[PDB]
Design an enzyme around this catalytic site. Sequence first.
Site, PDB file in Angstrom:
ATOM      1  N   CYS A 119      -9.668   1.476 -13.657  1.00 37.24           N
ATOM      2  CA  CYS A 119      -9.316   0.680 -14.330  1.00 37.24           C
ATOM      3  C   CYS A 119      -9.507   0.444 -15.739  1.00 37.24           C
ATOM      4  CB  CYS A 119      -9.892  -1.746 -13.076  1.00 37.24           C
ATOM      5  SG  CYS A 119      -8.656  -2.473 -13.993  1.00 37.24           S
ATOM      6  N   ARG A 122     -11.205  -3.596 -17.847  1.00 35.68           N
ATOM      7  CA  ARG A 122     -12.087  -4.509 -17.008  1.00 35.68           C
ATOM      8  C   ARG A 122     -13.112  -5.522 -17.693  1.00 35.68           C
ATOM      9  NH1 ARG A 122     -15.175   0.345 -14.010  1.00 35.68           N
ATOM     10  NH2 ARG A 122     -14.075   1.401 -15.245  1.00 35.68           N
ATOM     11  N   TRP A 291      -1.670  -8.555 -16.238  1.00 39.05           N
ATOM     12  CA  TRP A 291      -0.749  -7.698 -17.018  1.00 39.05           C
ATOM     13  C   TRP A 291      -0.625  -5.721 -17.420  1.00 39.05           C
ATOM     14  CZ3 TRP A 291      -4.441 -11.331 -18.871  1.00 39.05           C
ATOM     15  CH2 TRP A 291      -5.719 -10.521 -19.466  1.00 39.05           C
ATOM     16  N   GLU A 296       2.653   1.687 -18.508  1.00 39.13           N
ATOM     17  CA  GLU A 296       2.832   2.127 -16.919  1.00 39.13           C
ATOM     18  C   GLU A 296       4.100   1.871 -16.698  1.00 39.13           C
ATOM     19  OE1 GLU A 296       0.040  -0.809 -14.074  1.00 39.13           O
ATOM     20  OE2 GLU A 296      -0.535  -1.151 -16.407  1.00 39.13           O
TER      21      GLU A 296
END
Lengths: 421, 419
Positions: A119, A122, A291, A296
């Site tokens: 991720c 973070r 979000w 992506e």
Amino acid sequence: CPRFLKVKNWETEVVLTDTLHLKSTLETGCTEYICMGSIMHPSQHARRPEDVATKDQLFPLAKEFIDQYYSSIKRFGSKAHMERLEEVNKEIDTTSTYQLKDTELIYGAKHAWRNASRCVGRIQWSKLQVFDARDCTTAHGMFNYICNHVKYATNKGNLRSAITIFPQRTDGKHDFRVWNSQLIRYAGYKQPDGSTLGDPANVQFTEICIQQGWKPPRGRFDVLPLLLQANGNDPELFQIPPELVLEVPIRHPKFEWFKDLGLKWYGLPAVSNMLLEIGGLEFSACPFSGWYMGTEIGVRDYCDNSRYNILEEVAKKMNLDMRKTSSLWKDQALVEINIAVLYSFQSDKVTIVDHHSATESFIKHMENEYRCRGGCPADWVWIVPPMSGSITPVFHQEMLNYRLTPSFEYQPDPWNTHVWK
Amino acid sequence: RFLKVKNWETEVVLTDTLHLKSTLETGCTEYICMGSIMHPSQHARRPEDVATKDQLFPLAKEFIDQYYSSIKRFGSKAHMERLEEVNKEIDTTSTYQLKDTELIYGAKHAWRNASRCVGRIQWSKLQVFDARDCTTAHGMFNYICNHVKYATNKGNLRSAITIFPQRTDGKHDFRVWNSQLIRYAGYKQPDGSTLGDPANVQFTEICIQQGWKPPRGRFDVLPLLLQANGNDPELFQIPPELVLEVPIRHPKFEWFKDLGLKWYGLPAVSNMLLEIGGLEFSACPFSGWYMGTEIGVRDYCDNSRYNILEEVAKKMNLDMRKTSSLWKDQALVEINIAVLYSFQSDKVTIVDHHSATESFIKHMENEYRCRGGCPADWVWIVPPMSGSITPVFHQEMLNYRLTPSFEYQPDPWNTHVWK
Ligand code: HEM
Ligand code: HEM
Ligand SMILES: N=C(Nc1ccc2c(ccn2C2CCNCC2)c1)c1cccs1
Ligand SMILES: N=C(Nc1ccc2c(ccn2C2CCNCC2)c1)c1cccs1
Ligand SMILES: C[C@H](O)[C@H](O)[C@H]1CNc2nc(N)[nH]c(=O)c2N1
Ligand SMILES: C[C@H](O)[C@H](O)[C@H]1CNc2nc(N)[nH]c(=O)c2N1
Ligand SMILES: [Zn+2]
């Protein structure tokens, strides 16, 4: 393992020293003779519905988590710490499981996120709204919790990270599961001529929903129903109220024709098929949302050949030379699509982060974690964005990948394991 | 156990058995992955780690065995005699000499085994220049000139490697001190900035200290600094007619030529170490041709290299006030269009990252079928721009170490005692 491991940033020459890897408790999949760093789902990043802990397995996993919790509140060795250890141990002894305190549940969820090596977001980990849904008993109750989550996290576009946690696994035959892979996703429909309408990634799940009774509009961006399983029962279908689903029509600041492509996306990414593991307990239904990072949508969802696959149509409208790969027509169109995604979310005041800002923030987060925590596990293969890799700072950053608990893990798709009533 | 790798775009699954043959470590453990570390201890070779008679025979035996397995004569009379011949030679001299056939096989297989190289579909087409009779830096210069001339081939580039004498006691190493045969100088400026290539500032300072007269320009070709038999290195100027260069222009932006950019056509790595059968070739310059992104993304757009994004986006009149305009990404694509267009217009071999990664997927398919696998390092194989619109992004890879191999080694100026 050596006590100190160093990582270098090859752009800045900054050297960081990792000691947190000594606390790793789960395997990566690599060995000393082979590296599996690019394997998407090693069995070590998954949890089957059957490796349900026995009594003897659960005792040390629980103590390890309780110790870590009381160490975090600066009460290690305290009366409250020893009493909690004894209470949990008695619970495991008499019921073969135990219940987390609300404080521990919140700590555990935040740290599963903090520990998620793949991720890039973070830096936000301590700001997570935790919804305790462990009193839920039915699929209708799950629907209620999920709607409240969606409304809270969406916040009219000012997105807020959140997790909703349903009851933990018991014997494995009473699992709570969200069958959706995300709370909001678009249907995909395979056609008799072999083409696909909508999102090809969701074709299998769409077919399941249709079999369960969903009437499909058969459009390009049909929001899928929720398919919700409570207490091991057969899953049930629910329509998310459309006013709760925030969407963004995609347009371009320069190309007026871009809106004629008919593209849109939803604002809230909410992963609903992962498993949250805390202190040996397994939360098989734990939808969490943050979000988007723009790539992506603009790189993967739109431009993967196996997804909406729009590069050709965009390149055509840009009047690019498409007869040779070395004109980089695909690369040119890719940038313009990602400009369009960020511009459209920002114009509608829906939270989004570009890949330059996100990776720059991640470097600052990583450095802080190394200084305050002794390390930050990170999976380079996932952290580097899918376009323009080396003009982001994370490309040049050596990372160490290792598995800490609490953690988010993958789990088998429930239709492959469910015993139909 | 057999290991499977999946392509998540095509759903093609391949089954790796070749990894069962590796004996060298990766740096990873069951509990930590070091897959993004650039130089783990497991990809480098220090001079102190010279082999002994005792260490050398099993390594030699392993290599001879795989060579004779490769020509399908395992256990043959020739195979038996070669193992005995090598055994006696290590016994009586503490080392051995490769046959010419073995040197070629070993150099090609070091390339074939290079998990970080996307270019390996070409691995069996490699011209091998045997320079093991070389004794002086002047001899090294001659061999390197011949290599450069052969590989450049007036722009129709040809892969090649020149192999200088192997390490003996570690005090007599042959070394090319340059990192590549052709590179541009970099100069620290009074005002603290860098002129030319910042990557080469240290090597440039050594050349100047050794007497090189620097033109102090942005693209000055460096001299060769060559060390033979452990002696002090010596400077040489590559004849300029041998150095093929490409001025960078853009097919649509006529202002692009005014940026004054150029690059050289021949990438020729000269600081790596070739290991074959326990023998260490500390000077083994090898060359191929460029993938466009090496120049257009890394050389030109790394913040620590020529760092031209801002200048280009300026000339493109892009709004540079916010990162979300993706002005860097826009300029990046236009720079890489110019690099490919310029080499192609001058008929200098180059490959774009779409063609190169497509060829690498085909190569993996070939190797899995005929060899049982292909070690590959995703971190290096995926190009530094437009990653997921190339097929390797979606390709699971297994990384493991096979020998013969190319390895890193310390820079010679950190070890060398000047006489
Ligand atoms: C707050 C904004 C956030 C941003 C911008 C962000 C960004 C990302 C991105 C871009 C990915 C890669 C996704 C993909 O390629 O499919 C990812 C993965 C991930 N995110 Fe975050 N994320 C955020 C919040 C969260 C939250 C709130 C959680 C959980 C509480 C979370 C848990 C994870 C996990 C577990 C993964 C990797 C899954 C795996 O191991 O395969 N993220 N994130
Ligand atoms: C013929 C065309 C070739 C192409 C297009 C090509 C392409 C590349 C590229 C783009 C890289 C990454 C370089 C970087 O990021 O700095 C690389 C790495 C590498 N290349 Fe190839 N290459 C070719 C030929 C060769 C040859 C002939 C050899 C040796 C005989 C070779 C050996 C290597 C090695 C050993 C590496 C990785 C170094 C490491 O392990 O860190 N390549 N290649
Ligand atoms: N920004 C996000 N994006 C994102 C999208 C899909 C994700 C993840 C992490 C796992 N997934 C799925 C898992 C199944 N395979 C596809 C990826 C993150 C976030 C989602 C939730 C919080 S943040
Ligand atoms: N196309 C190429 N490009 C390239 C450039 C630099 C390279 C490599 C392999 C190692 N290097 C250096 C080693 C020192 N660190 C930076 C990378 C390949 C080739 C060079 C030779 C044959 S093909
Ligand atoms: C095979 C490879 O691991 C796979 O395509 C990975 C690469 N890196 C990724 N990185 C992110 N963030 N998300 C992904 O889905 C992937 N896919
Ligand atoms: C830290 C990271 O390993 C480093 O920046 C790597 C990433 N991938 C790379 N890939 C290639 N081909 N070349 C490189 O120099 C690098 N650098
Ligand atoms: Zn690894």
